[PDB]
Amino acid sequence: LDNNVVECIKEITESSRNGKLVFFVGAGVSTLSDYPQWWRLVDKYHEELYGSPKKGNYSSDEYLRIPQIFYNVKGEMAFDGILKDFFQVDKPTNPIHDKILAMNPAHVITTNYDNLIDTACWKRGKYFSVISAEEDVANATSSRYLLKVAGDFRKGFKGENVVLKEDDYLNYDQNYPLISNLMKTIIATHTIVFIGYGLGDYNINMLLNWVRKLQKDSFHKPFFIRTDPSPIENETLIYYENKGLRIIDAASLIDSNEYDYLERYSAVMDLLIESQENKFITKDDEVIDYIYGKISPLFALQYIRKIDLKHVFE
C-alpha cells in the first residue's frame, strides 16, 4: 500500500474516535441504491420542450439550462409534476450507507435530495436531526445534524424546496443564508471526507474556491474518495492536493472493472472500517506505542484499579 494512504487512514481513524468526523455524501452513494440520476430527469424535460430526445449528449454542459427553460416557458406546476413522476419512489439502502454510519460521524452533510440517508439512520438508531430548509436551522433538536444543502422533498414534491434549476445556484447564497453558514462552520470544526462526487463537481469547486479565501494553515484538509474507474494521473493529483483536498484514489488500491462502482466504494470504506478493528498493526514498536498512548496519562494517578483498565483498552 502507499506511503500517504497509510497516513490518511490513520488520520481519519484518529478523528472518528475523537468524534470529529463528517461525511459529505454525494450523488454516487445514492446511485448505488439505484435512485434516478438527474440526466434521466433532464432528458425528460428535453423530451417535452422539443419533442425529441437529445442525440448530441450535452457537451460543454448546456444541461445547466434545460430545466430553467422548461420552468420559464411552461408552468411551475408543469415542472413540479415531472419531479413527482420520478422521485416519489422507494429504493433500498446500499451497504455503503451502513459504512458511513459505522464510522460514527458527528454530522452528515449531503447534496442529495432523497430521504435515503434519513431512513438509514432511523433504522440504525443513531438519531440525526434533519435540516433541509432555512426554518429548521433554528429549530434543530439535537447536537447532531443531517444537512441537506440542496434541499429535500419532505415538505412537498415541488421545485421550490430543492435546488435544481439554474437560478437556484445563482440565487443561492441569498435564498439560503443560514445553511451555507452552517455548512462552512461544520467544515472548520471537523474532518471532512467526501464520498461520491467527482473532481469537477459544482459542489466541490464551489468549496475549493471558498477555501482559497482562508489563511495558510487555518483549516484541515478535506479527504476525497475518488472512485472513478480509471486511475488518477499524477498531475491531477498534484493540483488538487495543493488546492486543499487530499484524494484517496480507489483505482490505485484495487483493480476492478470499468463498471464495478459498488466494489470500489466497498473497497475504500471497508479499508476504513477495518482499520478501526486494526488488523494493520505489525511491528514491535507499533505494539509499544499503542499501549503507551493509553497508559501514559495514568502516571499522574497513583494506583489504578485493575478493572478500570477494561474501560481503557475499549
Binding site: 459505522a102 431512513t119 433504522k123 440504525r124 443513531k126 438519531y127 436531526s129 433538536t141 439535537s142
Partner: protein, 335 residues
C-alpha cells in the same frame, strides 16, 4: 427532585424552594369549592391530572397521612396468561402504531420471535410522523432485547440439550440469523438515550434506565434493604412499626411489575428480572416464617397483641409460578 415521592402513595417536600406546587394540588382535590374557581381551560387539564394521579396511586401529601391499604392491579393480558385473547388480538388487523407495539410484545410472549423482530421493525420505520417519539425509543429497546433473546437460543437448540427432544435443530433459519446480525452490529445500546432529542431527554427522562445492559442495578442495590431485615430478625427482638422494610420490598416489587408489563417491555423475560422477583419474594416468605414463630415478648405486649401477617393472594402466586424454578421453591419449603 423537588418532591420525594414515596411508594405508599405519599409526597414529601424534598428540594422545593419556592411555592409548593404539590401542596396546592392536593388541596384542589380535597376542597371541591376551591376547585370551582379556575378557568375553563385549566379545568379540563385538572381532569387529566386527577385521572393520572389516581391510576398511578399518588394519593396525598404526607402531612395528613391518610390511612392507606392500597392494592395492586396489573392491566395486561400477558401477565395473567390469557394466551387465547392475545392470539385473537394478533389476528385483529391493527389501526394504530401504539397497537402494533402491543402485538410485538404479545408475539414475543408467544415465542414468535421472528414476527416480533419484523413487526418492531415496521414500527421503527413507521414512527417518523409522530410527535412524542416514545414508540421510537421503546421499540429500539425491545428489538435489541428480542435480538438478544434469539442469540441465546441459537446456543441452546444447538448446545447443551440439543440431542433428540423434537425439533432438535434450530427454529431460526440461516437467512434470518444473518439478516439480524448484520443489522445489529454497532447498535450501541448506551447511545440510544443520548441520540434522541433534548426534548425527549427532558419530557421523557425516566426511560433513561431502560437503555442500559446493567438495568435494574439500581433496584438490586436497593433490595439490599434485605440486610435491614436480616438485621431485625438477627437482633431477634426488633419490632419494626408502620411501613416497615418488608412492605417497602413488596410495594417496590409491585411497582416494577406493573411498569414493565403495562408498558409492554420485553426485559420482563430476562433472567435479571426473574432473580429480582426471586430474591424479593423469598425474603418476604422468610419474614413471614420468622414472625409466625417469634418468641412472644415479655414487654412488647403494649404494642404486640397480634400481627395480621403476610398472607398470599393471586398476584403473589403468579409471581412465584412464573419466576421460580422447582429448585427455588424447594429452598423456601426447606426453610
Amino acid at each position: 427532585y423537588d418532591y420525594h415521592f414515596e411508594v405508599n402513595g405519599t409526597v414529601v417536600r424534598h428540594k422545593n424552594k419556592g411555592f409548593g406546587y404539590m401542596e396546592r394540588f392536593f388541596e384542589l382535590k380535597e376542597s371541591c369549592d376551591e376547585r370551582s374557581k379556575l378557568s375553563k381551560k385549566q379545568y379540563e387539564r385538572f381532569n387529566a391530572l386527577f385521572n393520572f394521579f389516581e391510576k398511578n396511586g399518588v394519593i396525598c401529601m404526607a402531612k395528613d397521612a391518610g390511612t392507606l391499604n392500597t392494592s395492586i392491579e396489573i392491566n395486561s393480558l400477558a401477565y395473567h396468561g390469557k394466551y387465547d385473547v392475545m392470539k385473537k388480538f394478533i389476528e385483529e388487523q391493527s389501526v394504530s402504531i401504539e397497537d402494533d407495539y402491543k402485538k410485538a410484545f404479545f408475539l414475543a410472549c408467544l415465542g414468535r420471535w421472528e414476527e416480533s423482530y419484523d413487526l418492531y421493525s415496521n414500527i421503527i420505520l413507521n414512527s417518523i410522523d409522530e410527535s412524542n417519539g416514545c414508540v421510537y425509543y421503546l421499540s429500539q429497546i425491545n428489538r435489541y432485547r428480542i435480538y438478544q433473546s434469539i442469540t441465546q437460543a441459537v446456543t441452546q437448540f444447538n448446545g447443551l440439550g440439543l440431542l433428540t427432544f423434537g425439533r432438535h435443530y434450530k427454529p431460526f433459519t440461516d437467512e434470518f440469523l444473518a439478516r439480524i446480525e448484520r443489522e445489529m452490529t454497532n447498535f450501541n445500546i448506551d447511545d440510544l438515550f443520548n441520540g434522541m432529542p433534548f426534548e425527549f431527554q427532558k419530557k421523557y427522562k425516566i426511560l433513561e434506565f431502560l437503555s442500559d445492559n446493567q438495568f435494574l442495578y439500581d433496584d438490586t442495590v436497593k433490595l439490599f434493604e434485605l440486610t435491614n431485615k436480616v438485621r431485625s430478625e438477627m437482633s431477634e427482638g426488633s419490632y419494626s412499626f408502620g411501613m416497615s422494610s418488608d412492605i417497602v420490598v413488596l410495594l417496590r416489587l409491585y411497582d416494577n411489575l406493573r411498569f414493565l408489563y403495562e408498558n409492554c417491555l420485553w426485559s420482563v423475560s430476562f433472567h435479571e428480572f426473574h432473580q429480582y422477583i426471586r430474591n424479593s419474594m423469598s425474603l418476604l416468605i422468610e419474614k413471614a416464617e420468622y414472625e409466625r414463630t417469634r418468641d412472644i415478648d415479655e414487654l412488647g405486649f403494649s404494642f404486640f397483641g397480634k400481627k395480621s401477617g403476610f398472607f398470599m393472594e393471586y398476584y403473589d402466586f403468579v409471581n412465584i409460578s412464573r419466576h421460580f424454578k422447582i429448585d427455588d421453591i424447594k429452598n423456601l419449603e426447606r426453610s
